[PDB]
Design a protein around this ligand. Sequence first.
Ligand SMILES: O=C(CCCOc1cccc(Br)c1)N[C@H]1CCSC1=O
Ligand SMILES: O=C(CCCOc1cccc(Br)c1)N[C@H]1CCSC1=O
Lengths: 238, 241, 298, 298
Amino acid sequence: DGGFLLWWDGLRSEMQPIHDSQGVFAVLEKEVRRLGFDYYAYGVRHTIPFTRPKTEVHGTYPKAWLERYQMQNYGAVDPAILNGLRSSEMVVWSDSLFDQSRMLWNEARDWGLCVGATLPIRAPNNLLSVLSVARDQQNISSFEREEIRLRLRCMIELLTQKLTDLEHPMLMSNPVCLSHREREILQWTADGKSSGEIAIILSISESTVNFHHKNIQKKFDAPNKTLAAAYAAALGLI
Amino acid sequence: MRNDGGFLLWWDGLRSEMQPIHDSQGVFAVLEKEVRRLGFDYYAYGVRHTIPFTRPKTEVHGTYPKAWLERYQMQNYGAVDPAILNGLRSSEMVVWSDSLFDQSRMLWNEARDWGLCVGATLPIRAPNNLLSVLSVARDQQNISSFEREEIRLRLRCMIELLTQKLTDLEHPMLMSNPVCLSHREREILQWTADGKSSGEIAIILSISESTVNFHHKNIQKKFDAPNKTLAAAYAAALGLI
Amino acid sequence: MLRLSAPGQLDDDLCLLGDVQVPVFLLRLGEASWALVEGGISRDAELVWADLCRWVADPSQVHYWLITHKHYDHCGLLPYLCPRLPNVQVLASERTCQAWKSESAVRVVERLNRQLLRAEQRLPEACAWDALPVRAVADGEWLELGPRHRLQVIEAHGHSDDHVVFYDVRRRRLFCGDALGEFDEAEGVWRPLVFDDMEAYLESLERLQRLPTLLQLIPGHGGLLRGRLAADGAESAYTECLRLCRRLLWRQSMGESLDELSEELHRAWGGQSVDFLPGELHLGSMRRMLEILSRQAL
Amino acid sequence: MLRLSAPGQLDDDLCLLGDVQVPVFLLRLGEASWALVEGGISRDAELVWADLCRWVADPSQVHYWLITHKHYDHCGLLPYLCPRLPNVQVLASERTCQAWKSESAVRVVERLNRQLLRAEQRLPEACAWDALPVRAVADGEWLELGPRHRLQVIEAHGHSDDHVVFYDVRRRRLFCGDALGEFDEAEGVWRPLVFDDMEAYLESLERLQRLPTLLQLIPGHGGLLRGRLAADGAESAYTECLRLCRRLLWRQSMGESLDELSEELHRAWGGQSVDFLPGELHLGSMRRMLEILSRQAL
Ligand SMILES: O=C(CCCOc1cccc(Br)c1)N[C@H]1CCSC1=O
Ligand SMILES: O=C(CCCOc1cccc(Br)c1)N[C@H]1CCSC1=O
């Protein structure tokens, strides 16, 4: 019937021949400006460093706003990104949403970020990603909210897949590969059994398993088993 | 914006239809009605956990033959089911074919024997890291290229709302082992998850050794742990840190 | 070609019996199970039978008859061909069968259909409408007609008080009847027909949008459709009904009489359907239509 | 009332002038300065002055002029009124100013304006087309016409590469020119106008229907539009462009050449542009439109 479905097929077929990230973000900017929004951003929240989870982001906002993030790092306290952790629902911005951290919202509204929304999604590799879209005027009605939801959902799905395929620095975290014995021994450590129990069930001497443990610690760059097990569980390798 | 009608108006209709429902059987009933309206006979919704790392627990509901369900409970194909495991690698809907099941053909043959020859299995990672898949299946009428993308979008919207509604209704599938951490339990377990020793944690946090070891005993007790590694692993997998 | 219009075969399992302006379709459910669809008119009985026996070994294999509508252009073929068929479950809506039981509706339908007869032919012998083998189908009922046909009844009210549409889920096909309109053979865009209500018509078209995209869309007049214009039919019908609302309200703001516009509608649109509507009663039908448009949806 | 036609005190601050079919819109924005829009055709000048002095006491106060695109039916008054208006300032897209500086696309404008002249008429003196004052205005550039008005230029292509539409936020009126289409006095629904590109045309109508619910809407032909017509005028123009696309694609499917459809559109819709466009040229214009639509629409 044309409209949405033909649009999705056309966008997919048009994004297929694009072999560069800048082309992907160019078509994204063109579509988001067709959707009525001046600014966009694609923001990936990692989950490896638990104390300081690094949030990295691309987009077309004022560059000094980006710089403001690299000084104060509002991604670690921004509620728009943090909504994706608790729920996968789209959230449209308001003064109510940012009551916990009003400094970010006030500084945003200072620089022409007064209307917008942010759709999160859990990527298949456990890395949270969000697509935000913003404009000055024309507060998002409840009528347009579902259309923006569907179109941002399609766009963020495609971008997530493509930027994973293009080996973008945002999506790709520290690459770690394990053969099946290392995955098995690390899984048995994740379902934590003592070393003697592991040796008994696997029927292998303690020296070989300790050699495997040292290999895993070196590969993850760990000082203890807990870092390796937690990082592997978070990254989904186990 | 009344130009496409179509998917937007359908999504509004299904959301309004599912909003006043307050029972899981009603949710599965409306999902069943749409999937038979879509063309496919059977469906399924399968939530794969990641808590027990050695043997991941998968819980599945739907309308398939009950003996096929009992086959799943017999020999646990959910760990071996490639259609479920594709959700880990990529978020693609994948139509079933003999190429996909090359690593595990016994499941494919036993499914094809009982009227599961055409179908699809769309995955999605739930917001608390639980994997979920919404599958549809039928006997004949192989999925043409014209129909595939509409199936992809419709199944994606339905699994999104299905997971949201079942989490709202507290189904056993989506509700993981309930662990409620305070702010300081989250902080101490996070700092443990970064491989920092107890003395170093005490030094940076400015709290005595006995208090942090008491908290370590506690967080071992709630996770039912014999080791810190299990607690940290479970916490990382569930999103608790 | 998008419009598969002429009689005979239309698909692997679907024929068109009789004239395309009042078509009578025929689903081949199985090797010995058939199903006629949409009905016809009284004059075409000896025509449609002459088609049906060509496509069927003997009439006993026909099992179902899916009627969408109450008006004479669909119910008309029932009493003249149904006795011939020894067993057919005429599936019509709950309110359809009430009309056929009613003594008022049968007289109206039979009179309106007897006007269309040519001077020569008399009609075949027929039973009363009350004695038909009817079945009631509700909103959203699942019709397991055969192994290879699963139809869903959807109450597409508004064009009439009992309208339903049968949607084949597997083949993505919709025997929509007059729920959409009279497909303009000349121009290409739809043509609204709201004869009993206007609010319900738009809601029915919203549900027809809620159906997935349609490979085929079969109206009650015009044969079959395919391609894009069969996929946005509910969008196009919603569009055209809104356009007619705009046209009527604008012309009434300009102050011309309500009947003045309806005569223009008859002049523009009745040439297509002159051969299965009387020329005079199209004017009255469009008069009642435009009165409903003036009444509702300001 | 929904289409205020005749010249007069058309709104609280706005006054139509000249012929209603191709007017120039005067805006009251100060007790010193004034402003015109939609610069019409050459022959209206002696008419427009006879109206303009009835509103403006002394035309030195007339500071600004707004122009929508380079076509003759929106810029005829420019060379014939700008020199006698000493403080005049014409606003239009960069492409529009470049078009007027170009030697080509001005002789054709002169021919099109001259074709619509009376027998004994003699147009007044005129400066060179490049000599008149112009300040190019781009997409989204906020315009400060006066303390009481703050217009917003909007890049709205599709009717031409040089097109704009001036939009006011406070009173929520809009000057479209031919961004939408020639409004229909009889039928009420818009007549689309595509002469350079559909893809820019429908994009423009998307970006114009995303605006607030417009209280007023002022095309370049046929006065002001008010109420429900102005509220969803951006929707109906998009709908009508798609409708004509459906009609053209259907006639291509049937096999009719473009000559028949362009002829049909000309004989249907020649009831307005006879005053300010020759009939022989309107056929060619509709032919170009239908060629663009056929080439671009799927
Ligand atoms: O956090 C987000 C989405 C990711 C932001 O992406 C950005 C932000 C600044 C520079 C650049 Br480049 C990208 N958004 C909104 C919340 C309130 S303010 C804002 O930017
Ligand atoms: O992928 C899935 C979804 C998980 C299992 O779904 C099922 C299977 C049986 C009963 C129920 Br209830 C759900 N099913 C497919 C894998 C190959 S065949 C089959 O049943």
